[PDB]
Amino acid sequence: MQYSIEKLKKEENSLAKDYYIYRLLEKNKISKKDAQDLNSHIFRYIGKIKSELEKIIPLKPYINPKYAKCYTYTANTILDANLTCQSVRLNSLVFIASLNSKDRTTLAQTFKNQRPDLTNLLLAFNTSDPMSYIVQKEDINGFFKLYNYSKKYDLDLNTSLVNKLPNHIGFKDFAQNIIIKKENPKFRHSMLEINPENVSEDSAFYLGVNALTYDKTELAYDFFKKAAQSFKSQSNKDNAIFWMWLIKNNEEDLKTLSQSSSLNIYSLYAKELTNTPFPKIESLNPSKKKNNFNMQDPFAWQKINKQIRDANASQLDVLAKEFDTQETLPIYAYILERKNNFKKHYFIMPYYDNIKDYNKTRQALILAIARQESRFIPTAISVSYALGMMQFMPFLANHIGEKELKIPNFDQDFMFKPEIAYYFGNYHLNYLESRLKSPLFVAYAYNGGIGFTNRMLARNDMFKTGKFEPFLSMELVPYQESRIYGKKVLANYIVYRHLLNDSIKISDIFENLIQN
Numbered sequence: 224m225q226y227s228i229e230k231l232k233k234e235e236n237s238l239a240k241d242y243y244i245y246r247l248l249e250k251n252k253i254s255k256k257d258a259q260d261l262n263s264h265i266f267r268y269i270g271k272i273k274s275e276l277e278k279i280i281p282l283k284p285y286i287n288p289k290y291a292k293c294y295t296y297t298a299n300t301i302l303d304a305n306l307t308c309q310s311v312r313l314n315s316l317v318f319i320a321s322l323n324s325k326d327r328t329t330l331a332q333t334f335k336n337q338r339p340d341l342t343n344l345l346l347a348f349n350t351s352d353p354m355s356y357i358v359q360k361e362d363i364n365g366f367f368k369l370y371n372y373s374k375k376y377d378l379d380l381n382t383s384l385v386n387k388l389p390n391h392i393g394f395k396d397f398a399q400n401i402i403i404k405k406e407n408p409k410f411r412h413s414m415l416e417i418n419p420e421n422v423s424e425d426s427a428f429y430l431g432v433n434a435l436t437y438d439k440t441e442l443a444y445d446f447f448k449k450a451a452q453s454f455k456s457q458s459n460k461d462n463a464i465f466w467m468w469l470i471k472n473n474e475e476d477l478k479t480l481s482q483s484s485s486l487n488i489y490s491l492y493a494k495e496l497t498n499t500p501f502p503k504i505e506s507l508n509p510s511k512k513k514n515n516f517n518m519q520d521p522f523a524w525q526k527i528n529k530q531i532r533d534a535n536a537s538q539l540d541v542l543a544k545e546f547d548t549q550e551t552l553p554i555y556a557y558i559l560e561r562k563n564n565f566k567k568h569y570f571i572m573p574y575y576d577n578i579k580d581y582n583k584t585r586q587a588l589i590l591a592i593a594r595q596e597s598r599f600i601p602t603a604i605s606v607s608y609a610l611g612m613m614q615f616m617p618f619l620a621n622h623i624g625e626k627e628l629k630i631p632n633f634d635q636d637f638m639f640k641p642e643i644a645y646y647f648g649n650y651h652l653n654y655l656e657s658r659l660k661s662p663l664f665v666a667y668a669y670n671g672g673i674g675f676t677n678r679m680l681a682r683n684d685m686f687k688t689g690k691f692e693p694f695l696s697m698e699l700v701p702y703q704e705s706r707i708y709g710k711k712v713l714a715n716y717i718v719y720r721h722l723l724n725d726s727i728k729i730s731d732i733f734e735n736l737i738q739n
Contacts, residue, residue: 224636228257236266237525238604245608248275255279267606298322302329309333313341316348316372324349340364354378367393374406380413386421395426402433403701412437419445423453428463432698435691444470457485465489469691486568488714492729501721504568507559513550519639521602531558553599560598570718573599574641581649583725588662589613589648591715592669595708602639611638613648623647661735663697666712671705686738693736 226243234240244265247253253261258279265272286294293308298321301309309330312318319327322345331345343365347356354376357365361384369376370393380388388394398414401407414433422430431446444467451463461483468476480493486502494501517523531542539562546554556569570590578586596614597603609616615623617635624633624647637643655665655673668676679685679701686696700706713732720727 228253232264234522235526236264237522238266238606238608239521239525239602240264241266241272242521242604242608242610245272245275248272248279253279270607298326302326306333310338310341313345316344316368319344319348320372322348344368352376352378358384361387363387363391367391367397370397377407377409379409382416385413385417389417389422389426395429398426398433399429399703402429402436403699403703403706405699415439415442419449422446423449424455425450425459427453428459431463431466432695435695436699440470457483458487461485461487461489465493465694468493469694484566486714486718488710488717488729491714491717492733495729502568504570504718504722505559507552507556507569507571509547509549509552509555511548514545514548516546516551516554518550518553518601521604521639524600524602527554528557531561536562553601557598557600568718570594570715570722571599572719572722574645577642577645578649583723584720585649585652587716587719587723587725588652588656588665589645590719591662591712592648592652592666593644594715594719595712601641601644610635612641612644613638613651615644615647615651619651620647623650661732662716663709663713663732663736666709666716667700667705669712670708671702675702675705680738686736688737688739693733696736 228244228247231240231243231247244253244261253276258276261276261280262268265276290308290311293304293311296304296308296312298318301312301322304312313330313334322330327345327349331342334341334345340362343357343360343362344353347353347365347369350356354366354369355378357369358378358380366388388397401410411433414430415437417430419427419430427446427450431443431450434440434443434446447463447466447470451460451467454460454463461480464476464480467473468480477493477497480490481497481499483490483493491502493499516527531539534542539558543555543558543562546558548555552571552573556571559567560569572590578589581589593599593612596609597612599612601612603612603614604610605614607616610620615635615638620635620638621633624630624635624637627650630637638647652665652669655668656662658673659665659668659676664676664680667679685699686693689695697706697710700709717727717729717732
């Protein structure tokens with residue numbers, strides 16, 4: 224089922240509409256005339272749809288009309304520009320780097336009183352190490368502009384300076400990136416002297432991980448304790464309390480972790496170590512078979528999803544009743560997760576007939592991936608236009624569909640069919656498992672590609688033997704999305720194996736992650 228550009232313009236803006244516009248663009252079906260008023264019909268003007276539309280209508284914009292004259296100057300003529308223009312152009316460190324040193328000295332004096340931040344950057348670029356100059360002034364704003372300009376700068380930072388960095392909004396991403404990428408070792412070592420009083424939440428957590436890489440277990444405990452006290456989400460608290468336990472072995476930490484309302488790998492592990500029963504998994508079994516909603520219509524999902532997200536307690540009860548059917552089970556569960564304020568545990572098994580002939584271990588992995596990828600919504604579409612319950616990108620879907628399986632009249636929109644999604648998911652999971660074995664490693668590869676997973680596993684500091692392994696390595700996966708994805712899919716997999724009466728102990732999974 225195609226949609227022409229006319230039909231699409233009559234639909235509301237969404238990721239579904241973006242997807243169908245992108246399909247027209249890749250097939251060269253959008254003329255220069257169709258493309259004129261098209262920016263206002265795109266929900267997320269980023270990535271592939273933007274670069275494709277810009278081959279048709281290339282946009283020169285956007286400079287602010289107030290500062291238009293300021294962008295006519297260059298490095299050779301900046302001293303002819305008025306003071307407002309000079310200051311605007313000095314926002315760019317590349318521009319500052321391009322200036323000659325006589326003109327940097329001149330501008331530095333011009334700006335000493337009213338903007339000493341500019342003065343420090345100007346004079347810093349007259350040296351062979353701008354980072355060293357900015358560090359000596361303890362100019363915190365300048366430090367972050369330099370780091371964003373270039374990641375190669377690396378230098379030891381003293382106690383006074385590192386303790387000022389956390390007050391800047393850049394700090395969290397700065398600390399995480401250098402820690403998980405294992406870059407800027409002098410910055411990393413310096414961050415051992417940040418007082419836990421001065422950090423919180425994610426920044427405290429990563430400063431704890433950093434302390435562990437230098438075997439500073441006492442500093443690590445203090446950071447993780449601060450993370451546990453300050454974290455918003457119960458899931459992140461648990462992650463931090465686990466580390467508190469692993470380092471200092473206090474049984475009250477483990478007990479607290481075993482009694483957590485969040486179902487995650489850390490609370491599940493704590494329950495297993497204390498002989499606490501497996502948590503209660505809700506049971507959704509609607510008597511009503513079907514209703515008038517079309518689960519194969521991606522536009523209807525975008526519409527109903529926005530209703531659900533932007534609704535009061537009263538409207539969620541009406542929606543709950545309407546979608547309490549077998550045909551709409553994934554929507555029901557979606558509504559109930561928001562109706563109960565994320566307190567209860569929903570692990571549905573929809574369109575089960577398509578997977579009941581696989582072994583129960585494979586069933587659980589399929590279900591665990593699907594739960595995380597789409598919450599079982601058949602027409603789910605990601606921002607990169609991954610499609611259906613198992614979130615296949617068009618390239619992979621066409622390779623499997625057209626070349627490998629030779630399906631007649633295959634179109635990528637077949638990924639919206641549960642039968643096809645599960646089938647292809649099984650096929651692709653088969654390929655990943657034969658090479659990787661652990662369901663955790665499969666999950667990393669399913670999300671980030673087998674390329675990066677093999678690169679990570681080929682390193683001699685990842686998933687090898689050690690005091691805190693494999694738990695330390697799970698915190699050092701070099702992409703945030705993949706670190707998180709793996710933890711969640713692993714918990715899902717444990718739960719689904721339990722519901723299917725093929726339980727496995729999570730301690731066995733953790734033992735199999737250590738490469739021998």
